[PDB]
Every structure is written in structure tokens, then in C-alpha cells.
Amino acid sequence: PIVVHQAISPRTLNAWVKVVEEKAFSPEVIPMFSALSEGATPQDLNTMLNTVGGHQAAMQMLKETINEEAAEWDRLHPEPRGSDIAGTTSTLQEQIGWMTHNPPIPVGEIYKRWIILGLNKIVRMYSPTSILDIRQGPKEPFRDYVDRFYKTLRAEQASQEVKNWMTETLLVQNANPDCKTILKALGPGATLEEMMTACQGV
């Protein structure tokens, strides 16, 4: 919080702690974190991150990724350095000045980008199953299976085109035999609503 530095709310800290403690590491943690880190100094990021009680193993993986990114930054620049971004060797006043100067260098933004980059890997590791193993049960209602598949897809990591192809084909190719005929009959241009409402009775 920059106004001069402003102390983070104990309410915000408690909310983030509870989110990490209860929500396992389901994907919605990534935006929720981004929700609570608007204009936050790297020192504030460290204060937010350290407070996590459990899941300490996963946090360590995060630490590793930071180093790598920091190394890459230290490779780019022969002026804050890689360790300066993490706040391990920067004062609060210096950090405030860096993103209060005109033009401001987005130290907070780049740190948050690094942390998000790590959290993506964390989520992928904690993801239960790969996108390819999602198959519909013979009696499973179609809506639940579609939602399960889409959650899993949101978990997995690939570029945009791979996701587009996955959505276009894999869902149909893995449905239960009863809805398979209806889906293949519907065509390639059917929207999701039509597909779900067609098998709604089943």
C-alpha cells in the first residue's frame, strides 16, 4: 500500500491466511492472491507470504522458482538487482522511491509476476489428475462431468491453442457411450448450452 507506505490490514492478512489454509491449492487461489496484492510493496509481499502456517513443503518449491527468475533478471542487467526485487536487500524507503519516482519501475508488479509464475507450478503439482484421464461414469449426470472436466482443464498448463483443441474434441471423445451418440450427432458447431441441454434428461 502506497499513498508513503501504508500498513496492510490485519483483516487482509487474516483473509489471505484463511484462503491458503482452507482452499488447499485449488486454482482460484491465484486470482484471490492478485485481489489482495493491489499496489503492495515487495516487503508487504514477503510479510503476506511468510504468514502461511501449513503447506510449508509447497512454499519451498515456490522459493526455488523465485531464485531462477531472479537469476534470469541478474542475467538481463549487468538500478535494483535481482535480490533487490525480493526485498532481501532493499529498504522500505528505497522500494517506495523506486515505484514513486517518475517514471516508476514496477518492482511490486514484477515480484507479483514472479510469485504468480511459481504458484502456477504449485497448482499444477497439486492438481489431482491430468486432463486426459477425465472420463464420464456410466451413470454420472452430464452436468457434473462437464464441470469436472472444465475444472481439470483450468488446472492444466498449455498454450491457448492446445486448450482450444482440447475443448473442441476431448470432452466429446471421453463422454459416456449414451451421450456419445447424441454429441457426435449434434455437430462441431454446437455451443455448450445445447450440448448440456440435449443430454439433460439422461
Partner: peptide, 13 residues
């Protein structure tokens, strides 16, 4: 090696 294992985040060297 900005962060060492076991050390807290943002702990100075």
C-alpha cells in the same frame, strides 16, 4: 542464489 532453503522470505544475508 537469492533465497536459501529454510531461511524465511526476505531475510537479509
Amino acid at each position: 542464489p537469492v533465497l536459501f532453503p529454510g531461511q524465511p522470505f526476505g531475510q537479509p544475508p
